[PDB]
Amino acid sequence: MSLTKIPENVQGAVSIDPWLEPFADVLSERRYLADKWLYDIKHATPDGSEQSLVDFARNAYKTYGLHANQQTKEIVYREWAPNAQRAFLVGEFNNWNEESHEMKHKDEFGVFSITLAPLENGDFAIPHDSKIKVMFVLPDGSKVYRIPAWITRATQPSKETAQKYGPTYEGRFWNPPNSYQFKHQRPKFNLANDSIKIYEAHIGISSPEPKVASYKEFTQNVLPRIKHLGYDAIQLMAIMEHAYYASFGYQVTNFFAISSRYGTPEDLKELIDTAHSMGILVLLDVIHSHASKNSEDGLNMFDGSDHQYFHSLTSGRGEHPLWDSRLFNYGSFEVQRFLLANLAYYIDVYQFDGFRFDGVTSMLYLHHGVGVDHEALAYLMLANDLVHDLLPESAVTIAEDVSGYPTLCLPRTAGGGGFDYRLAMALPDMWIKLLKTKQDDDWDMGHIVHTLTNRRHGEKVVAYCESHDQALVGDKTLAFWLMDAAMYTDMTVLKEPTLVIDRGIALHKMIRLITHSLGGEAYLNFEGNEFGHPEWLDFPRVGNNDSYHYARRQFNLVDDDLLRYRHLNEFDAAMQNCESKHQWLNTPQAYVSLKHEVDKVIAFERNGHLFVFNFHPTQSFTDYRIGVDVAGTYKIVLNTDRAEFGGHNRIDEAQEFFTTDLEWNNRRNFIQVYIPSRTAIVLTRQM
């Protein structure tokens, strides 16, 4: 007779999905842990008075690491290392002198500090971009050498250096004479109302050449392509420094250093700034789920102990079962300061507009996706608080959570994780399952509609038909599933396409469009797939003799108007710009009027627009009836059969579609449409 009491701090989530009722208590405990940490953080002040979460994170990156005073020419450096007995700044600037620059002051927090005077010259004491290390003397007298944990630049060693000492990266004191000044405002963007169509890019592969392409080359050659496509946002992977290129950015060594293989910090500021000038948001892949096991150039054993940034190896919670990486102890206050300031640093110093948090499934569960980890989840809650506080109403957080953990994308005040979006990581496999195991006359329209619309209430989803995982080695893209290893000879416009190529081109546009229109509240496209990029992605590694042959993007294919790759690309641009002109993404779910299993026709309304798909492998339809609620005149605003998109130009896009007042498919009116086999159209009503 115990009255089931839903604690007020999860009242919002339980209202949104009453399924959460029997878990209300555990949900309440999860949020309460984070809210108490939030109180803790907001009172980490000298006098114990309240400070904002933003000020806490900003003060952190402003006072940790190294900082050149441009008007007094002094340089301050602070480093957290409680297990070290002594700390010394060393490098080129003092000929690696292990006695002249002791960090003599060790905090009650366990932070060492040192202030370097200007040289008699008046110059900075550490030359711009010279190499440095921090040396720790441990209580047993031994020494260890580390790249400062908040260094803003770390560089691969030279051939001469790597032969003598090894592949360890080298810390750089970045203090350029003229730091880049941002010129452009952030694009107008409201998270609650505006759609976000996201282009997932990687600087290093963004050129047809087998090299690590630069930030400057992305800015000059790839940005204009992304504006032409009409995406609202770019999701920059593999920016956080990582020694191992083939890790695709997921083995982070230096959390406050943008990767130097593509260029300098000022090169990346320019990239984001000009994207902003182009109206494009820029988001950062943030890997706070784990860290590389590197010592000296990473955080492993940073201060000599095994319980500083990470849970200890003996604790059982210190290393990942598969990734060979160390797991953060989120319960440590300095680790919380380290990660939260890392977020404020990327938003403020590089003017990113949001983040995708990778490895969220690994964080959420004590088994890391092969029992929720309240500490890891509570840090993500804090992380969402800070990010949304840094850019109110516009900031974007996206979660890579394969588990679909309920409430991850409900607001914090409701009792949720605070994530704006989760990735629809299940969608790509649905398309693979069809192409691999089912012939076209077997496609269950109902199962397609079900999978695409199976979304938790309140938890907005970034839909995509394939992602950077699918493009990687070990898997096949949709292009490869559809058209195999098509050459430039198979893809020429000056010859009618084979049955395989004709079917591949059409399905490739259609799969994207129904994912785009029915599968979520946002859209994502991995660099290259928008024009059916051939082959696959692969980074240099021992397994392929360090080949860069697949570590590239053949953007040249889009530019050849005698190849069909341009057809796929131009449809993609027309898809994004149509949605931009006629919003359907960040809107309530479609009202699906039709999912015909014999005709293989799917039809639905979303935000007033009409979406019709004929997936039949062979059967065209004339005067096919489509139920429409709002009566009026309808005109096609997107047509996959258009010749410029590689279709056969059978549908008349100038036709006026007048509704008639007869009930059809539980809709008050109907229109009649011409939809040939393997074509799709989108209609809007005229005002």
One-character DSSP codes across 566-623: HHHHHHHHHHHHHHHHS--TTSPPPEEEEEETTTTEEEEEETTEEEEEE--SS--EEE
DSSP of 394-454: T-EEEE--TT--TTTTS-GGGTS---SEEE-TTHHHHHHHHHHH--GGG--HHHHHHHHH-
Which of 400, 459, 535, 579 is an active site residue? Answer: 400
User: Which candidate, 414, 437, 448, 421, places its Cα nearest to that of 520?
Assistant: 421
Contact 534, 553 (CB under 8 A): no
Q: What is the DSSP letter of 542?
A: G
Catalytic status, residue 385: no
Question: How far apart are alpha carbons 561 and 565 in whole angstroms?
Answer: 8
Residue 237 neighbours by CB under 8 Å, 6+ apart: 200, 201, 202, 248, 249, 285, 468
Question: How far apart are alpha carbons 59 and 338 in whole angstroms?
Answer: 11
Residue recorded with tokens 């699918």: 470
Which residues does the annotation place in the binding site for (1,4-alpha-D-glucosyl)n? 96, 133
- Residue count of the chain, please give it: 687
Q: Is 77 exposed, middle or buried (0-12, 13-18, 19+ CB in 10 A)?
A: buried
Bridge partner residues of 643 (DSSP):
none
Question: How far apart are alpha carbons 517 and 677 in whole angstroms?
Answer: 19
Name the method of structure determination: X-ray
Instruction: Please report how the helices 374-390 and 24-42 are oriented relative to each other, as an axis angle in degrees rounded to 10.
Output: 60
β 131-137/170-172 pair status: antiparallel
Question: How far apart are alpha carbons 34 and 228 in whole angstroms?
Answer: 42
Contact 610, 645 (CB under 8 A): no
Residue 373 neighbours by CB under 8 Å, 6+ apart: 363, 364, 365, 366
- Phi then psi dihedrals of residue 513, to 5 deg: -70, -40
Question: How far apart are alpha carbons 673 and 684 in whole angstroms?
Answer: 13
Q: Is 165 exposed, middle or buried (0-12, 13-18, 19+ CB in 10 A)?
A: exposed
Strand order in the sheet with 75-80: 65-68, 75-80, 111-116, 105-106
Which residues does the annotation place in the binding site? 96, 133
Question: How far apart are alpha carbons 339 and 404 in whole angstroms?
Answer: 24
Q: How far is CA 361 from CA 27, 365, 372, 378, 501, in A?
A: 17, 7, 10, 14, 38
Question: How far apart are alpha carbons 204 and 245 in whole angstroms?
Answer: 9
Instruction: Please report how the helices 445-453 and 499-518 are oriented relative to each other, as an axis angle in degrees rounded to 10.
Output: 40
User: Which candidate, 246, 201, 323, places its Cα nearest to that of 546?
Assistant: 246
Q: Is 51 exposed, middle or buried (0-12, 13-18, 19+ CB in 10 A)?
A: middle
First to last CA, the chain: 59
Catalytic status, residue 273: no
Which H or E run includes 673? strand 669-675
Question: How far apart are alpha carbons 98 and 492 in whole angstroms?
Answer: 66
Q: Is 592 exposed, middle or buried (0-12, 13-18, 19+ CB in 10 A)?
A: buried
Which of 297, 358, 373, 527 is an active site residue? Answer: 358
Token pair for residue 491?
Answer: 């893809």
Question: How far apart are alpha carbons 669 and 272 in whole angstroms?
Answer: 48
Angle, CA 444 vertex, CA 457 and CA 483 arms, to 5°: 105
Question: How far apart are alpha carbons 449 and 14 in whole angstroms?
Answer: 27
Bridge partner residues of 594 (DSSP):
603
Contact 607, 587 (CB under 8 A): yes
Question: How far apart are alpha carbons 473 and 137 in whole angstroms?
Answer: 44
Question: How far apart are alpha carbons 176 and 170 in whole angstroms?
Answer: 17
Question: How far apart are alpha carbons 470 and 428 in whole angstroms?
Answer: 8
